Design a protein around this nucleic acid. Structure first.
Ligand SMILES: [Zn+2]
Ligand SMILES: [Zn+2]
Ligand SMILES: [Zn+2]
Ligand SMILES: [Zn+2]
Lengths: 87, 85
DNA sequence: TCCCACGCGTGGG
DNA sequence: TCCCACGCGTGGG
């Protein structure tokens, strides 16, 4: 059953929310803006895939590298300090 | 602009690689398996979106949490030893 | 409800 | 046919 019809192209859809997003293919409406870069998308899931992989993934990869490095510097300092005070 | 043709459904395509992956929709071929859960995909980019979000992001979050914890304990052995000093 | 995932067309490198 | 990103159909929960 496809009870929801687009009045522009007359295509029917099984879901009303899918009819709503489909209509944006005609209107060009992009309600969802990425908070990091500002790129606009027609649907929230399109914004999510974009942000997850284009931003979150590399930010977390960079963070891991950064912490490994900070932790290495701190360990070096802790080792030095330990000798200055004994241990 | 669509010089390639699928001989199963007669659809025309702009590119040879796109014709190739399209044919997989008819044959059911899924060459790409996710190394983490084993799920199969027709294309590498399908496998990538799945793996990146379903497995990798959670993994990275855990890693960052773990490293942040080690960091916090080290920034503590330091403020401390410098007190002994 | 309507986010989320996935399939798959299709451009770029 | 390689890798990838994004649009957009559409079911699951
Ligand atoms: Zn329409
Ligand atoms: Zn963005
Ligand atoms: Zn075909
Ligand atoms: Zn997987």
């Amino acid at each position: 059953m496809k009870p929801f019809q687009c009045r522009i192209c007359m295509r029917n859809f099984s879901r009303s929310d899918h009819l709503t997003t489909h209509i944006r293919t005609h209107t060009g409406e992009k309600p969802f803006a990425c908070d990091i870069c500002g790129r606009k998308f027609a649907r929230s899931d399109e914004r999510k895939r974009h942000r997850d992989i284009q931003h979150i993934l590399p930010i977390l990869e960079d963070k891991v590298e950064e912490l490994l490095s900070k932790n290495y510097h701190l360990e070096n300092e802790v080792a030095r300090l330990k000798k200055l005070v004994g241990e």
